[PDB]
Amino acid sequence: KTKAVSRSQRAGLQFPVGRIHRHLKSRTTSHGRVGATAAVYSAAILEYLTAE
DNA sequence: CAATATCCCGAGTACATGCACAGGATGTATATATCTGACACGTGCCTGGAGACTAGGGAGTAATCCCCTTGGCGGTTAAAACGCGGGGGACAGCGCGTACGTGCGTTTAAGCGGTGCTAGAGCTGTCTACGACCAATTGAGCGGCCTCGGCA
């Protein structure tokens, strides 16, 4: 019980790391969506919404 | 008519294929399971219908010459065919990676309770952007003034 610190702010990102995990699991994916692979995927989505 | 070529038919030709075999891993088979979602029930919305009217557009025509279309153009190479060069083709082996097996232990999923992030709320509450209109500018064409070249 020490408050909470969202996975977005821990990563350094403005896109929602939690929401995207829960979207990847229950996509047409196989049965194991590692958590470090929702951070290298909020990033390589937010990067277009900068570069575009 | 002559000639190069494609077509056609039979001999002779390795191996490819279809098969039989051993055997192993998985498809079946039964019992159990909850829960997906089927189904049933209303909720409330928009999809649709249905009218009146302007004004924008659409259709039409008319005139016409631009552009396409055609013929005939003159100019130069891809094709034809040959000579001619080297290069794609067929064997000997090394060991390095790939696989595969072993035991490597990292992380996720789940179920837990707490809580703050977000996404529907407003007439929010305005005021960027949206017309509406004005004004400037350039460019083009038409008059008008003025030296000089070819003709009496």
Q: Rg of chain A over CA atoms, in angstroms?
A: 12
Which method was used? cryo-EM
Question: What DSSP element (H or E) covers A48?
Answer: helix A36-51
Q: Give yes or no for CB of A24 within 7 Å of strand B.
A: no
For residues A52 and A4, what is the distance between their CA atoms, to the nearest angstrom?
32
Residue A39: exposure state from Cβ atoms within 10 A (0-12, 13-18, ≥19): buried
CB crowding A19-33: b at 16 or more within 10 Å, else e: ebbeeeeeeeeeeeb
CA distance A34 to A42: 13
Q: Is the CB of A22 under 7 A from strand B?
A: no
Coil/strand/helix, residue A24: helix
Instruction: Give me the residue label for tokens 């020490």.
Output: A2
SS3 at position A31: coil
Fill in the DSSP letter of residue A29: -
